[PDB]
């Protein structure tokens, strides 16, 4: 609802697409993000957004075609090419976008290490690499052989859900913080190593993967600070271990 938003409001959304070999190698990682700006009062039509960038991943940034590229490059401010022009009112504008594509394992936010071993014992663990992130509702979905009953769960951090129809074991949580970077799950079921792949990972973070934030908004005329709100989300398109 507009009542929950300041008259200057930004939605900052990122999506990750990631494929990993079970060996731990990164086959492909793609990150896409954008800042969507929404103004509900022409009083704030002629503003500049102050963008704080603490990212060292080599993310590629692209400004909206109406946005002053040199201003952003030199001053990390988002403003229109024509300062006298107003941003649209009650209409979303993608003022900034970014992209990262890479095969450097160092950039994996959350590594997954699944080791089946033969009466199969499966041991799987995660480790949070980016201490910046706080991951909620993490579900690690593990496929299972069919026709051989339920898996028998041993030591586990967090909880699970076994689905007989889908032949899956969903491994849920614990909250994954920089204070609690790692956890593991062990279970057994009659099968072969390949039965347990591809492993799927799902989560939703309220902190962006890219260390990019809007910290201030000012009037073009007179540079006065302006109230603003933000909604930040980091979502998974694909996160699979092959």
Swiss-Prot record:
Signal peptide feature range: none
Modified residues (Phosphoserine): 224
MHD domain ranges (all copies): 5-242
Annotated positions of the N6-acetyllysine modification: 43, 85
Subcellular location: Cytoplasm; Golgi apparatus membrane; Cytoplasmic vesicle, COPI-coated vesicle membrane
Expression across tissues: Ubiquitously expressed.
Domain of life: Eukaryota
Physiological role: The coatomer is a cytosolic protein complex that binds to dilysine motifs and reversibly associates with Golgi non-clathrin-coated vesicles, which further mediate biosynthetic protein transport from the ER, via the Golgi up to the trans Golgi network. Coatomer complex is required for budding from Golgi membranes, and is essential for the retrograde Golgi-to-ER transport of dilysine-tagged proteins.
Assembly information from the UniProt record: Oligomeric complex that consists of at least the alpha, beta, beta', gamma, delta, epsilon and zeta subunits.
Family statement drawn from the similarity comment of this UniProt entry: Belongs to the adaptor complexes medium subunit family. Delta-COP subfamily.
Protein name per UniProt: Coatomer subunit delta
Organism this protein belongs to: Bos taurus (Bovine)
Gene: ARCN1
Full-sequence portion shown in this chain: 268 to 511 of 511
